[PDB]
């Protein structure tokens with residue numbers, strides 16, 4: 001009856017097209033190489049029933065009130081908690097593009113919802129060991145593949161989101177990484193910060209502690 | 210640029226198969242007769258994308274974590290706020306089977322979620338003028354048409370839900386109605402309590418004030 005967290009849980013955050021996927025795949029490949037068992041997840045997961053509606057929303061194929069889409073994103077997060085506990089419990093690590101901090105930055109920055117009201121439903125989600133924030137200025141990524149395809153990918157929106165991410169900018173678990181560099185440079189900083197991680201089984205923590 | 214609430218907003222609450230639909234249809238028919246324009250709504254609304262998943266959940270055709278289904282119910286509530294404001298603004302009344310109080314009683318009573326965590330996401334929903342609680346004891350309705358068809362319709366669950374409804378039992382807007390009587394008796398009590406309602410345009414209020 002051991003229910004200690006054995007794996008470590010790592011989150012990449014950032015504006016749209018900031019290299020989250022690139023970096024998280026790199027981190028994953030590096031951990032498989034160094035023999036850590038690891039599982040790559042991401043939010044939103046567009047493949048569930050809730051995910052499908054989220055996806056129609058991001059493509060501007062439907063529309064919905066600000067409150068409804070926020071709660072759907074949060075529900076999509078909650079449908080992964082058993083899977084996430086499961087893995088962590090098994091000592092498999094979890095590397096995830098996006099988490100609840102996306103809730104605040106996007107729902108509070110782009111959709112102007114109250115910050116506290118946005119955080120409430122995500123309260124009690126599993127807390128990660130570290131979040132890497134791939135920091136790029138609001139106008140930086142407008143030229144990368146496909147940008148502007150989904151609803152929030154306009155620089156003026158990216159500005160507000162960028163401003164709203166600051167709400168976590170000075171937290172302990174939060175590591176600003178300059179993502180205006182070469183892929184390999186970003187990657188080594190991440191690997192370096194990952195190596196400074198304690199490997200011991202511990203208790204789970206929960207948002208927003 | 211008038212944005213006063215003109216209509217009145219009435220909610221029926223109660224355990225499963227307690228006569229909500231019966232009473233709300235009666236109230237509606239009575240208001241059309243006395244020449245009030247009125248719109249009958251209900252939650253969950255199973256016809257939207259979110260509604261469809263809620264519906265699969267109640268039929269036990271899928272399953273999901275407690276947190277996810279709660280947030281879907283709350284999202285389903287939020288997708289009706291524009292429609293509800295719209296009507297109230299126009300002076301059309303709204304009579305509704307079920308609202309956010311169902312969130313507490315069901316999510317907190319049957320699914321054992323924390324009461325405050327359940328209320329948070331519904332905070333900011335339009336507050337109704339009155340809630341009629343069709344009060345029946347937990348074992349009372351087990352013999353009415355079709356009972357036991359959906360997930361919460363087992364007396365042991367109805368017990369907890371019944372206990373959890375008490376959280377509103379002593380509030381101002383909340384009117385206990387003995388629903389163990391004849392349809393016509395229940396109806397006259399409701400009509401009598403409805404006639405004691407002030408007809409004047411006012412400001413909107415919001416949950417959980």
Ligand SMILES: Nc1ncnc2c1ncn2[C@@H]1O[C@H](COP(=O)(O)OP(=O)(O)O)[C@@H](O)[C@H]1O
Pocket residue numbers: 014015016017018019020021022023097144145179180181182183186
């Ligand atoms: N550091 C970088 N330099 C140049 N191109 C990059 C860099 N990082 C990512 N890209 C490219 O920019 C686009 C966005 O990358 P991606 O990992 O999918 O971002 P995100 O997950 O944030 O949406 C992709 O085409 C990716 O190849």
Ligand SMILES: Nc1ncnc2c1ncn2[C@@H]1O[C@H](COP(=O)(O)OP(=O)(O)O)[C@@H](O)[C@H]1O
Pocket residue numbers: 223224225226227228229230231232306353354388389390391392395
């Ligand atoms: N007071 C009553 N006496 C006898 N039968 C009733 C009474 N009220 C409702 N019913 C019947 O019991 C069942 C549940 O009624 P309904 O209005 O659909 O409940 P609810 O909306 O709470 O699910 C229906 O068959 C209804 O006709």
Ligand SMILES: Nc1nc2c(ncn2[C@H]2C[C@H](O)[C@@H](COP(=O)(O)O)O2)c(=O)[nH]1
Pocket residue numbers: 016043044058069070073074098102103104106107111150152
């Ligand atoms: N409003 C809001 N948007 C979110 C939330 N989580 C993710 N998003 C947005 C961020 C991205 O613009 C978008 C698409 O995701 P992607 O390309 O995978 O990072 O979803 C959330 O919780 N709230």
Ligand SMILES: Nc1nc2c(ncn2[C@H]2C[C@H](O)[C@@H](COP(=O)(O)O)O2)c(=O)[nH]1
Pocket residue numbers: 225252253267278279282283307311312313315316320359361
């Ligand atoms: N857990 C939970 N259940 C709800 C909520 N709202 C409604 N329900 C349940 C109450 C009823 O059992 C069920 C079916 O609705 P109905 O027959 O229309 O009253 O939905 C909610 O917010 N949370």
Ligand code: NA
Pocket residue numbers: 016017150
């Ligand atoms: Na994106």
Ligand code: NA
Pocket residue numbers: 020021042097
């Ligand atoms: Na991505």
Ligand code: NA
Pocket residue numbers: 225226359
């Ligand atoms: Na029911």
Ligand code: NA
Pocket residue numbers: 229230251306
């Ligand atoms: Na009903």
